[model samples]
Target: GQGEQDHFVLKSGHAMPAVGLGTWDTAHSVRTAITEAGYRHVDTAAEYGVEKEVGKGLKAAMEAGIDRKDLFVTSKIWCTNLAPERVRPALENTLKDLQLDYIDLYHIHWPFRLKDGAHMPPEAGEVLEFDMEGVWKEMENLVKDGLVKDIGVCNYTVTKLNRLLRSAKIPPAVCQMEMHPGWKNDKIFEACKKHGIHITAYSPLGKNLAHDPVVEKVANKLNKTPGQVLIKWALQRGTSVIPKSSKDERIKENIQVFGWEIPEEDFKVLCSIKDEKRVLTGEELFVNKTHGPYRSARDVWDHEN
Candidate 1:
């Protein structure tokens, strides 16, 4: 059988690779995933502080004969740079670090917009207003300037996304979020589908999912790894997934989800599991009861339980 290379066509008319390598690993792993493991899409964020490494890996992959256009690169503007004026320079920094002229997709890393260089657990005055419309205008302009093919967002709730969609001149093509079997985020999924915005699921493997009894059972029945089962479930749900791994074998295994399908019986079983535990609650990072916006984790997701 032929090898798998599944891609999804976005509302912006760009075909994004279904499974992408989430770069929390070394440059060697990033490079090998692209050049050797058949990965065509790479995801990184400046806040992750791995842009330079991702650049090195991407460069090595390119030098090995992959064209720039053949691969899709995604980078996000950190919360510090969500300010309209800072968005460009932040992206420029990402470009310089990644050693690329243009990325395929760009995203607002989070709904929060702390003052430039503000530390997490932001100082009293460090947390600034989100400036949703103004900063979004800059994201749209980035697309027009040819710095990125398509634009999207991350860590946004249905309320934030709806607000953005209301005034957005150029609608977001994708909404990157923490989605997994435990945190189904069904409302966000419903919203994205209604608006034709694709979702790219981060944290596809939820906390404790590796040891979930049902997950293990399904994988055993399929003769696959639990990781594969989880990733496949995400794909079959029609959203792209980016599962990160530091090991080479796991990186390769995370991408081997195509050609095979998750059965409806097992899909329903996974879907029906009474797993309400959300892995990344975002309390420390995004919630600030003192800041007067997101008072709790519930507020962070617009209480989208």
Candidate 2:
């Protein structure tokens, strides 16, 4: 907890930890370790349904005298809830389960479609549809209601964000996505940055499946873990990363990225090594026999049209 610093400031006048704990596969004890490791940010979603566990860990921290305000928790609304007036209730449920009165940040988990109460089985030609303008109005209403401190989207492309911004009364403050050495997403990143939106990198360590060979080799040369190398690379590049791990030692190591910075040369090398891959490809997952971005009432995610 020594070198940890506040990195994200939400439009709602709250702060998000620059680097935080991700709960995708986090084990019981590792969450404790990561929280104790000074990760003030905890990101989750309604579909993930891990808010209870996150609140449990945060409660433990609080009982030990950690300030509740110091911990920034983020939960997201599922795509199915993007309907005109449903996002508020969905977020309220997340906060209720988490035992918090308000969420530090709330995001629309995706720009595309998700089937109602099922996982990717919405017939062959089903396309998703939502009124982006209406959704934005409702999201802004949350701020007016003091339910969420900041508003944003995850996995939003430039085309999608542009559409939202065209009619948005309040623009998104954060663009969270799967960013790593294998996928740079430069065009999207630039667009978000141009709009004064901060980027949060998920799967910062390449999701541990097929990390960049060059990055791994560099890690070996520096006698550091590949995970650490990736975390440091993200931190040095002015973005935030949540490298999920349930290992106690790994959690401790990941928090050490702030102590020693990766060299500029190594940073450039890491940036130059993009292979254009993604860990979780929701865009591809939803792509279907639709002749265009929309085949049914739900498949309207095609931003190119």
Model 2 steric clash pairs = 127-298, 127-299, 128-298, 128-299, 129-298
What tens-digit string does per-residue lDDT give for candidate 2 at 99-175? 78887778888775555753353445444666778887898888778888788888777888898899888888788
Predicted candidate 1 versus true structure: per-residue lDDT over 1-305, tens digit per residue: 11133888988889999999997456898899987789999999998899999999999999999999999999999888878889889989999999999999999988887776665555567767888999999999989999989999988888999999889999999999888789888888899999999999988888678688889999999988999989888888888889888888998888878778778899999888665867777776666677646677887777776
User: Which candidate has the top score in TM-score?
Assistant: 1
Give the clash total for candidate 1: 0
TM-scores vs. true structure, each candidate: 0.95, 0.88
The local distance difference test score of each candidate is 0.86, 0.72
Q: Which 10 residues in a row give candidate 2 its minimum summed lDDT?
A: 296-305
Candidate 1 ranges with C-alpha deviation above 4 Å = 1-5
